[PDB]
Amino acid sequence: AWPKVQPEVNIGVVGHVDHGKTTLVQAITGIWTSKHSEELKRGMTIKLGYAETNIGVCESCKKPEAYVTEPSCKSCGSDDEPKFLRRISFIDAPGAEVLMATMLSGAALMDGAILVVAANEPFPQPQTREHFVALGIIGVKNLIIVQNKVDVVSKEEALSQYRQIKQFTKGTWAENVPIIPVSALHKINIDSLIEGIEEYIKTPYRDLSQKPVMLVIRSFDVNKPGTQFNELKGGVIGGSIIQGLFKVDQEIKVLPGLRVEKQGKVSYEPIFTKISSIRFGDEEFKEAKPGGLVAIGTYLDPSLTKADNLLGSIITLADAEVPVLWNIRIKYNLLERVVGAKEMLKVDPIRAKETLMLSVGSSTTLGIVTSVKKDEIEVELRRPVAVWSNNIRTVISRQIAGRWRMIGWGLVEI
Ligand SMILES: Nc1nc2c(ncn2[C@@H]2O[C@H](COP(=O)(O)OP(=O)(O)O)[C@@H](O)[C@H]2O)c(=O)[nH]1
Ligand SMILES: Nc1nc2c(ncn2[C@@H]2O[C@H](COP(=O)(O)OP(=O)(O)O)[C@@H](O)[C@H]2O)c(=O)[nH]1
Numbered sequence: 001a002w003p004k005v006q007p008e009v010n011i012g013v014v015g016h017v018d019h020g021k022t023t024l025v026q027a028i029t030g031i032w033t034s035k036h037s038e039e040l041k042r043g044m045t046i047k048l049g050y051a052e053t054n055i056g057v058c059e060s061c062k063k064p065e066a067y068v069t070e071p072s073c074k075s076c077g078s079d080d081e082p083k084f085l086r087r088i089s090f091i092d093a094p095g096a097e098v099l100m101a102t103m104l105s106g107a108a109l110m111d112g113a114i115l116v117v118a119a120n121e122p123f124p125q126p127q128t129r130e131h132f133v134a135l136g137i138i139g140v141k142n143l144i145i146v147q148n149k150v151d152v153v154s155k156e157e158a159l160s161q162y163r164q165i166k167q168f169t170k171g172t173w174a175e176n177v178p179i180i181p182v183s184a185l186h187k188i189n190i191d192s193l194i195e196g197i198e199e200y201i202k203t204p205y206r207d208l209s210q211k212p213v214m215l216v217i218r219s220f221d222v223n224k225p226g227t228q229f230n231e232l233k234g235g236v237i238g239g240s241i242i243q244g245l246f247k248v249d250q251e252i253k254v255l256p257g258l259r260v261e262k263q264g265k266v267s268y269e270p271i272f273t274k275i276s277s278i279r280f281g282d283e284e285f286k287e288a289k290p291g292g293l294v295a296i297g298t299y300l301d302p303s304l305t306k307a308d309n310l311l312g313s314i315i316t317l318a319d320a321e322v323p324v325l326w327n328i329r330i331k332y333n334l335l336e337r338v339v340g341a342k343e344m345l346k347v348d349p350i351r352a353k354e355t356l357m358l359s360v361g362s363s364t365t366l367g368i369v370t371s372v373k374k375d376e377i378e379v380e381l382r383r384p385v386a387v388w389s390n391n392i393r394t395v396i397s398r399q400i401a402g403r404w405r406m407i408g409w410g411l412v413e414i
């Protein structure tokens with residue numbers, strides 16, 4: 001048998017709308033990540049999607065067919081059990097141009113990524129460009145480019161696009177990134193992709209002695225109809241542990257916390273609770289480390305967590321010291337052009353009194369620029385952000401032609 005363990009790595013899946021991201025995750029894991037009503041009706045990812053799979057290798061078989069996602073080697077002609085390598089997980093991002101902020105919030109959780117490029121669409125499409133730029137900005141450099149839908153183009157066309165992709169990455173940080181052709185729909189060459197994941201998206205070093213921090217991307221009420229009047233649970237909070245570790249029965253707090261009234265003013269009150277349970281997928285654990293998206297059970301009133309109420313929060317230990325800031329100072333840089341538009345325009349300099357969008361960890365916040373300098377802006381936010389470390393990455397977006405567009409990036413200066 002294979003061990004039951006948490007995923008140890010988060011692999012983002014990004015790219016232009018309808019290029020096959022969600023179908024690719026299904027090809028690898030068997031899971032369709034779209035669970036919301038609107039997602040199923042529109043046939044598109046809207047919230048961040050998630051799926052897990054074990055990875056192993058049949059030591060008697062040849063690569064890439066030796067790579068498997070289940071404990072059998074029958075497919076490569078061996079009766080031996082495959083050696084367990086690791087459990088991995090996927091963050092399935094929306095490629096819709098209006099959902100870039102959600103993509104950015106997911107990118108904060110990624111240890112590496114797959115950029116999916118449809119072989120039967122002109123290259124590079126706007127969000128192919130935009131997601132590529134975002135990965136580079138955020139520092140997700142462990143990248144595999146997947147050439148999807150090769151089932152519906154000729155060898156000639158696929159090779160032509162292959163050359164254009166290599167020329168696109170030429171002279172960039174991604175110059176040496178592998179390109180792997182697949183059909184997600186017909187599950188062709190998926191084994192080569194799994195091999196590629198093992199080779200190019202290794203499990204990164206973790207620091208388990210840093211103060212525990214989890215970035216929140218989901219929260220919900222797990223209570224269902226037809227259940228006994230006392231089997232019901234406190235709120236559950238879902239996210240990615242980015243450093244340290246959490247254990248059942250630990251005293252934790254949610255930051256910035258709950259929006260409340262205090263002395264005639266809007267205020268945020270840290271939410272204190274205790275970990276009641278830890279779950280990855282369908283399995284319970286006594287502790288949780290970086291890698292995967294974890295579900296943290298709490299003793300909170302489920303009305304506090306329902307409907308992704310706590311998205312953008314962080315969780316730390318109860319006694320941890322973490323800045324929660326209404327005003328932030330950012331050492332910034334601007335992109336030269338707006339890459340996400342069909343027509344790429346120049347980026348105008350930041351001006352005082354502009355309303356900008358700030359992506360910090362899993363959080364997304366609007367604020368007003370109160371100050372602009374050469375290297376530095378100060379922003380008054382519509383709600384505070386938890387800044388758990390010095391020099392955290394922020395991505396800056398501006399509303400251009402009715403759409404929020406990434407225009408720069410920086411470090412939050414504390
Ligand atoms: N022919 C072909 N169609 C595909 C392939 N992968 C995905 N599709 C189709 O592309 C459409 C969008 O796929 P989806 O997973 O929703 O892409 P996403 O929007 O990037 O997440 C669906 O109709 C898929 O069935 C493929 O490898 N070959
Ligand atoms: N920690 C913890 N997580 C849970 C518990 N029950 C469900 N979850 C997690 O909550 C997530 C969604 O639950 P599910 O019943 O599948 O869907 P939902 O209830 O409609 O949101 C899953 O990732 C589960 O692993 C629990 O008792 N404790």
Ligand SMILES: [Mg+2]
Pocket residue numbers: 021022023044045092093094095
């Ligand atoms: Mg999708």
